[PDB]
Design a protein around this ligand. Structure first.
Ligand code: ZN
Lengths: 17, 91, 93, 112, 77, 252
RNA sequence: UUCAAAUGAGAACUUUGAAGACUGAAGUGGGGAAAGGUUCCACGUCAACAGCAGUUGGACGUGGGUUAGUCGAUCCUAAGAGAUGGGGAAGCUCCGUUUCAAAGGCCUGAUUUUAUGCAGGCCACCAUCGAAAGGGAAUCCGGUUAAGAUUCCGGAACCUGGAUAUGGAUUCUUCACGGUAACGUAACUGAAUGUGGAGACGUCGGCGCGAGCCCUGGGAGGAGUUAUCUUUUCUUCUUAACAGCUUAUCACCCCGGAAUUGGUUUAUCCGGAGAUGGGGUCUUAUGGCUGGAAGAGGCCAGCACCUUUGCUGGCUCCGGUGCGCUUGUGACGGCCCGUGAAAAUCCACAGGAAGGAAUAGUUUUCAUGCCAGGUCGUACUGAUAACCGCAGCAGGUCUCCAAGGUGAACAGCCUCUAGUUGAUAGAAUAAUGUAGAUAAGGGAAGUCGGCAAAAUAGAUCCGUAACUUCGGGAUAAGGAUUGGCUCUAAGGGUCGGUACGAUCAACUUAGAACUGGUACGGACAAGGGGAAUCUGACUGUCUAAUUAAAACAUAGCAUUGCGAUGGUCAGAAAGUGAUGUUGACGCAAU
RNA sequence: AUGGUGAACUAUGCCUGAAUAGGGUGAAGCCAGAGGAAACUCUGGUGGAGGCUCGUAGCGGUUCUGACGUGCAAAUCGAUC
């Protein structure tokens, strides 16, 4: 929703390959 | 004192747009801001405004001419090729 | 009022109290406008009073336009000088 | 050190919402709405403003008297008073030229 | 809001068959540089404008009051 | 896919002409009894600039032959026409700059402009600034006159068509470079919404046939056939030759 | 934020007084637009709401409040929207806006059967909607309410529409005189029709003028300070719409005839197409005087006194200054391949159709007098609490008015007017944090990487390279000076004369001594620089909410299609459209 | 798939209005002086040009990958730019 709770796009965080 | 060596009126553009593009404009910007002799009143009061329109400062005569020159060289031959052809109608 | 009284005497006006440029505190155009309006007004009142003729006025109007007359005292010294040599030439010719 | 507000519902600085600051007899500063200034009438062909005519708003020209909108000379409130004298030389000379050209035409078919 | 300078024209406005109220105002003024004098102002209320006449001489001030018609209601000060 | 840019210009929503400051339709005087059996005199009242045009317009006032009034027409000013000049329009007019004559009476080699295609449309050919046509031949039978168009085409039209003698003022306008996008922004600000133009190769495949790919390239031939379909005509339509010619210019 | 008092069962939070502070006038000030809809005001109440509290509240309960011929809507037209006549579509409906239409009524004359039938002539413009920031008939001042006013009251004006009368003017030369002229007047017939003007216009730059504000002198009042000093500090001294007279830059007229060329702006334009000069005319933005108008308002004093509360005296004056701030305006100059709305409406001129005097007529564009001016909106907020965000949310949301000092400055900082002191508090000062800082010696050894931080900083003077499209680079790089106090020099205005004084008023620059814990753009404010490579020419633009870039755009360059029965594109169709109010120096496609 | 609703956010065009301190640099035009046989060239002023530049209001959102990250906020706050 907001600027927090980030899970999807990522530079080196989760949801990679 | 001569402030600039060769840029002349194109010194307002700075270092931009290139030297060759600034030289063609310098040839046409001088002509479009120069003063010209009025054929009717004999005074050098013709100034350019709304290109294609040349108005006399006094004398109120407005002459339609070229974009940057009162009489273009391509239109001077037109003024002479009609005068030459007109004289053959009555003679 | 006390600070403005000291500024009239010349205090608080050194190099350490200037934060703007010389043109910002007082523009050079205003000094030039003040210079011509004194020279042209003095030169016009001399023509009306008969102290100068119209031929000398015309060559001094254009001379005062460019340079060489930085104040009124410089113009009146040139007018007397230009009138002193004008009468010695007439007395000899 | 006294500030003033608008006197009408328009809060924008449009061309019809000019404000002049006026000191009232009450001793306070108060705004006054001024109207747009009138333009002097112009001549029909020379473009200069003809003299002798008052400069008013067009619909308040119907309230002023006759002498404020015209000149006793013919073509008074329409021409430039040199525009009139220019078309009198032209009206007199051309009609004098048109009758001396009619007798030159008469010279042709009467002698050929 | 109109000023009248003629005293003979002023008397004609008082008998215009419509003016009902007139006021006389005494003003305490002073001359060029010396003594104060008595300035009077005769104001007549018409139907579209207020006519007034100012007299700076006290000799002519009293003379004009008796010349006013008695059908006109004069309001002193 | 998506509807490409040139297909959207036919709807006319934001691509219409900006016609607020324009002075009117520049048309010749209508063909009446006076212009085909004599001539009529008009006065050049005022020459004015036209928004969105390179050539100035001229206010010419004629007298109505059938009722007491004045009729002001909108002419295209030629180079040499001044204010207060008498303009003669009709069949019996002289060969002066600014006069309107039928082109079946002018000699060969006359420099005319604002030429009617058919007699009655009040000027169709040679209307841009600095452009003119030349009468190259005359056919007394069938009242057909041969001229050369500014593009170089040699058309034949009726001898009853009219044309104004001279060359249109405002020539040499395109000789000066604009030097910046700011001056090009104001040029197209009063003509139509067609600037700036995005290249078709730098867009997506939905937006152009040239879009897509890992490199900016067209992919297929840029020459499109004439009998193509609206949506495919992007590039050089019905081109007979391509490239820069290292030789002589336009033929005779 | 603190203290005291008042109210109350109850007070860190209510009210009052006192003190300390802040917003610093691009405000936490005074007003509006959009939006909200009674939140506005009074009284009563504290269950719920005001994430603590509550005697308080934008809460709850009960009532009160919005007054217009002059302010707006109403009217006009802009981009546009959209009936009719017609043409499409099975059809809901689509096209189209003067379009293949038999498209309509105005001044009157004729008529004393009665009301308008009927005789001319005229004009063809041919719905309507579309702006509370465009165009536009006409109002101001003072007072007044718990809450309303340019709307109420008092006084003073103006416009429109319609009636007619009185006076004046003109007429027996029927439809006025004067001035050489520009033109002037209290008035001084004018239909059809035609013409012209106003309405009606970009931006920037300096200059002139005006208004308000700022600054300041004398004087007449009041207040503050006084150990000492200070003819001191602060405050009051105001004049509306409208009316009469008068007043200027520009412009114009007459006389006159200029080279020994002259006149003239800050900015170089003008003159035998008639300059300089002399004498005049006009516009009245604006200013001046008077009326309005002191009777008002303001500042004080002297009295009355539960009280409706007043009464009586005074003063309210005369000046100066400017690269000042804000704003209006005038004449100019620069810029464009950009030349920078329309209509309603009003006026003038051309025109000479008609109507008219002598024992009498005509003009309501001269003056005065009479009547009427409807409908709707009108309170308040306009935002760290009244709007939109689930809310009393550090977010978002258009505009006007702008005091003093420092300084180039609407920067930062402090103060006046005005407005707030509202964000749950109390007690201690562990770790770890967030924000702000300082560090000896070394000076990037840290790190993917000088990330972060530091240093540099204003002004004046000196000095300034390679390279280059000759315009730049450049504040290149690199150095010095800066306080206070006492002085000196230079730069002006006005007045009587064919020579010089007198008097008055500005902050600008330069220079010299003296002085100090060597400090001095002392707070605030305020560029790190250099040598090269890759890349894009530059200004500009985009992934609102992870990617601002070398990506896009750009000028330049090149190619292609098209001469109107056409090129490119739209629509189901169409008597349909866009480019096109267009025409190859164009449009369309790359 | 069928039939309807939305451009109050945002994208673009048009119409009508509004808004934007103080400095730096000094282009054309012009004046005066000097040198030169000429052509003309230099010097001092004037003037105020720029999709110039420093920098407020405004607009934007580079970095600290700071604060916050069941936040004041379903995109904000601070410094910096
Ligand atoms: Zn001329």
């Amino acid at each position: 929703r907001g600027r927090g709770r980030g899970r999807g796009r990522g530079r080196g965080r989760g949801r990679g390959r | 004192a001569k402030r600039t060596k060769k840029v002349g009126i194109t010194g307002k553009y700075g270092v931009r747009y290139g030297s060759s593009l600034r030289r063609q404009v310098k040839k046409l910007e001088i002509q479009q801001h120069a003063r010209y002799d009025c054929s009717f009143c004999g005074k050098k009061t013709v100034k350019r405004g709304a290109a294609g329109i040349w108005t006399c400062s006094c004398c109120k005569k407005t002459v339609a001419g070229g974009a940057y020159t009162v009489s273009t060289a391509a239109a001077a031959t037109v003024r002479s090729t009609i005068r030459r052809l007109r004289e053959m109608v009555e003679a | 009022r006390a600070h403005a009284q000291s500024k009239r005497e010349g205090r608080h006006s050194g190099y350490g109290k200037r934060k703007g440029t010389r043109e910002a505190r007082l523009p050079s155009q205003v000094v030039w406008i003040r210079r011509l309006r004194v020279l042209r007004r003095l030169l016009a009142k001399y023509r009306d009073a008969g102290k100068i003729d119209k031929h000398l006025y015309h060559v001094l109007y254009k001379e005062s336009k460019g340079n060489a007359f930085k104040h009124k005292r410089a113009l009146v010294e040139h007018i007397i000088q230009a009138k002193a040599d004008a009468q010695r030439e007439k007395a000899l010719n | 050190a006294q500030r003033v507000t608008f006197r009408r519902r328009n809060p924008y600085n449009t061309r019809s919402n000019k404000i002049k600051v006026v000191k009232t007899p009450g001793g306070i500063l108060r705004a006054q709405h001024v109207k747009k200034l009138a333009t002097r009438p112009k001549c029909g062909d020379c473009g200069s403003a003809l003299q002798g005519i008052s400069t008013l708003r067009p619909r308040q020209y119907a309230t002023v008297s006759k002498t404020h909108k015209t000149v006793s000379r013919a073509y008074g409130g329409s021409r430039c008073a040199n525009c009139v004298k220019e078309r009198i030389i032209r009206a007199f000379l051309i009609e004098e030229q048109k009758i001396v050209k009619k007798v030159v035409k008469e010279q042709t078919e009467a002698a050929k | 809001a109109r000023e009248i300078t003629d005293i003979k024209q002023f008397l004609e406005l008082t008998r215009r068959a419509d003016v009902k109220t007139a006021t006389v105002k005494i003003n305490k003024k002073l001359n060029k540089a010396g003594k104060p004098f008595r300035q009077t102002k005769f104001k007549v209320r018409g139907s579209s404008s207020l006519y007034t006449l100012v007299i700076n001489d006290a000799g002519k001030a009293k003379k004009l009051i008796q010349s006013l018609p008695p059908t006109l209601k004069v309001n002193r000060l | 896919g998506r509807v490409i840019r040139n297909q959207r210009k036919g709807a006319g929503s934001i691509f219409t002409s900006h016609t607020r400051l324009r002075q009117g339709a520049a048309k010749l005087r209508t063909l009446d009894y006076a212009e085909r059996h004599g001539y009529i005199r008009g006065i050049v009242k005022q020459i004015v600039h036209d928004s969105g045009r390179g050539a100035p317009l001229a206010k010419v006032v004629f007298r109505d032959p059938y009722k007491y009034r004045l009729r002001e027409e909108i002419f295209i000013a030629n180079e040499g026409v001044h204010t207060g000049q008498f303009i003669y329009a009709g069949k019996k007019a002289s060969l002066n700059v600014g006069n309107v004559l039928p082109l079946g009476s002018v000699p060969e080699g006359t420099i005319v402009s604002n030429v009617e295609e058919k007699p009655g449309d009040r000027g169709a050919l040679a209307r841009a600034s600095g452009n003119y046509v030349i009468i190259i031949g005359h056919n007394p039978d069938e009242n057909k006159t041969r001229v050369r168009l500014p593009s170089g085409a040699k058309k034949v039209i009726s001898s009853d068509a009219r044309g104004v003698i001279g060359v249109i003022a405002g020539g040499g306008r395109v000789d000066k470079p604009l030097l910046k996008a700011g001056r090009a922004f104001h040029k197209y600000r009063l003509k139509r919404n067609s600037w700036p133009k995005t290249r078709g190769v730098a867009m997506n495949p939905v937006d152009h046939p040239h879009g897509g790919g890992n490199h900016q390239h067209i992919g297929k031939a840029s020459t499109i056939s004439r009998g193509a379909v609206s949506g495919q005509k992007a590039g050089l339509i019905a081109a007979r030759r391509t490239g820069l010619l290292r030789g002589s210019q336009k033929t005779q």
